[PDB]
Design a protein around this ligand. Structure first.
Ligand SMILES: CNCc1ccc(O)cc1
Length: 330
């Protein structure tokens, strides 16, 4: 089997991308944020505290003939930005892009934090990191990908995110029309439950490539590219008037600037992030200070190759017995 779904940016900055997902029978279609940095499939639901729901589409298990309470199971998760959600668990049929899983754990939110309520475009998250991070207790549950794997033609999914445009998530096959050149594969560590890999270095604009190992994760759920402070300072030093602002919470730059590209290494291959991808626009409506798309990972405890980086590439998440990541230009 295979599946193929279009993913669409939630706003004009590509803060996140939402992909339609069918849950239940008859289908209830919710727009979820596919997240390679977490391992829970959770939804706004008929159980979510009514004051915490503002415009999201909800899953109603009582209207699904295939929904079953997973008796006793609870879940609770927090994300890097201080947002969180928790609730109980149903099993139901879940389809993505034509690929169906029966008996998928669908984590129903009873509570969500403010930055979920305030985003009407995200109806939940679909985790695609390793199932060892799933928060369901007392019986940990599998991700949609881990449940689908045995049915797939090839144990892979691919992320092809758009810059200010829709893109595609594919399951079970590699669309050889979707990228240019060859895919370079690189080793993954699953020790922390993430798609963790080591980049071979970086360049800023037309500058020389610096060969240096940068451990990090491939995380579709993160907007920005979070790298060591050395690397980030080297990038922003090339933008006149850029500075790190404690008040704003990262590097800002004059909106009048033209940003340089950023290149990262994948083995002997190179992925070039155009400068335009690093612009996240005014810090506040009408400001002439703009927020940068490359930020320090100091204090996060991990480097994160988020959407700024991944949208520059065709990315293969190879879930074979020995997992690997692949990157191609496109
Ligand atoms: C913006 N805070 C809620 C949130 C949204 C999306 C996501 O991947 C994690 C957390």
């Amino acid at each position: 089997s295979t599946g193929s779904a279009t993913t669409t940016p939630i706003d004009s900055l590509d803060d996140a991308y939402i992909t339609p997902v069918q849950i239940g029978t008859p289908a209830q279609t919710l727009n979820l944020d596919f997240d390679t940095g977490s391992s829970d499939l959770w939804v706004f639901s008929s159980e979510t505290t009514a004051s915490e729901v503002d415009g999201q589409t909800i899953y109603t298990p009582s209207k699904s003939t295939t929904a079953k309470l997973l008796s006793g199971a609870t879940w609770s998760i927090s994300y890097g930005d201080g947002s969180s959600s928790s609730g109980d668990v149903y099993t139901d049929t879940v389809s993505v892009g034509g690929l169906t899983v029966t008996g998928q754990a669908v984590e129903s939110a009873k509570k969500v934090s403010s930055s979920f309520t305030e985003d009407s475009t995200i109806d939940g998250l679909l985790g695609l990191a390793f199932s060892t991070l799933n928060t369901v207790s007392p019986t940990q549950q599998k991700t949609f990908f881990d449940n689908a794997k045995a049915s797939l033609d090839s144990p892979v999914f691919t992320a092809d995110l758009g810059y200010h445009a829709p893109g595609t998530y594919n399951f079970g096959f590699i669309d050889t029309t979707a990228y240019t050149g060859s895919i370079t594969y690189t080793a993954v560590s699953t020790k922390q439950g993430f798609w963790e890999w080591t980049s071979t270095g970086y360049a800023v604009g037309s500058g020389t490539f610096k060969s240096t190992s940068i451990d990090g994760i491939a995380d579709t759920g993160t907007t920005l590219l979070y790298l060591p402070a050395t690397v980030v300072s080297a990038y922003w030093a090339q933008v006149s008037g850029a500075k790190s602002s404690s008040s704003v919470g990262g590097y800002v730059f004059p909106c009048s600037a033209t940003l340089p590209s950023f290149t990262f290494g994948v083995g002997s291959a190179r992925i070039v992030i155009p400068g335009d991808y690093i612009d996240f626009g005014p810090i506040s409506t009408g400001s002439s200070s703009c927020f940068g798309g490359i930020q320090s990972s100091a204090g996060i405890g991990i480097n994160i190759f988020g959407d700024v980086a991944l949208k520059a590439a065709f990315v293969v998440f190879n879930g074979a017995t020995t997992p690997t990541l692949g990157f191609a230009s496109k």
